[PDB]
Amino acid sequence: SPGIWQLDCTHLEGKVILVAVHVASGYIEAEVIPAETGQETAYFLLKLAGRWPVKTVHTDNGSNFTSTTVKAACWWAGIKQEDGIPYNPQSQGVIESMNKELKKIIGQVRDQAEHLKTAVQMAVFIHNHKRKGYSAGERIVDIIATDIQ
Amino acid sequence: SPGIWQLDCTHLEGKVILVAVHVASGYIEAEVIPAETGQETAYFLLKLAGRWPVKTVHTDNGSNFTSTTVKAACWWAGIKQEDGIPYNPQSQGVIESMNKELKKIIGQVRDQAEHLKTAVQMAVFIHNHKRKGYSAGERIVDIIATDIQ
């Protein structure tokens, strides 16, 4: 569980928001890109894996699952690339709910920045610090630390 | 403190590499930018603070210390902005040594990517996973987890 991440792609203002969620904690990382390509997805995973111990990634769709560039980045970074098929049917709605919540937070900060990418990073901050009573940021560190010890 | 980070700026291939180092662990995050502006530095800190519990940032120079954009981002993110003056004289050489090591790693991966930004992220990965026997990635998580508990 502590090394499992899920990729997610959502759209806003004619742009793409690429999201990685740490499944056990709800912690997220996100970036804005013009469009979802293998190359952008590969780069995003390289960034992620340098920052957290990414063991397994459930890809967000078949194109990223198939992409040789993505497969190469996963090989390079020591990541097991898997499908994101909701074998547990709960996963479709959970991703839906996350995107809705993320977009809500983005709406709450949107006027504090000119560029969407900035609003997205503010939303990542707010999401990861929100107390649920631990935050997602606290949960991910605790989960991984316990795994190391 | 577990919340203390140091900003660092170095140059390669006519571009700027902006680095944040977690002082207690040696863990790093980095990005390539065309040039170091207040705006780029502010954005980098917003990204960092959404991902790790950043309490204090020692800025890399007086322009970023002075920048109203940087000060605004620090206020927004709940970061105490401080100078980076080596009151301990050892800090100048330690940063120097880090940049030299980072550039060495970049050289070792440079031919595996077209774009410098990609090589920099590969170097971040290698640095953060390198054992010596825990890695920087392991140390940062352990330090912060202990702080939470």
Ligand SMILES: O=C(O)c1c(CN2C(=O)Cc3ccccc32)ccc2c1OCO2
């Ligand atoms: O509000 C949300 O649903 C939400 C989540 C939910 N999340 C978890 O806690 C565990 C998990 C696994 C897979 C997908 C999502 C989740 C996570 C991040 C969010 C959420 O709203 C905004 O950012």
Ligand SMILES: O=C(O)c1c(CN2C(=O)Cc3ccccc32)ccc2c1OCO2
């Ligand atoms: O060439 C780039 O800079 C680049 C790459 C390169 N690349 C692959 O095609 C497969 C791979 C595995 C590990 C590391 C790098 C690569 C991939 C994605 C990129 C690249 O520039 C921006 O986004």
Ligand SMILES: O=C(O)c1c(CN2C(=O)Cc3ccccc32)ccc2c1OCO2
């Ligand atoms: O406007 C942007 O998108 C942007 C900003 C905006 N900004 C400030 O000027 C001060 C501040 C504090 C907290 C959040 C945002 C801002 C800053 C940096 C940027 C921005 O676009 C890219 O880099």
Ligand SMILES: O=C(O)c1c(CN2C(=O)Cc3ccccc32)ccc2c1OCO2
């Ligand atoms: O080789 C390096 O010096 C290096 C460091 C050093 N580092 C720590 O271990 C603790 C610390 C506090 C303040 C500044 C630097 C450090 C860190 C990161 C690196 C280093 O080489 C490449 O990436």
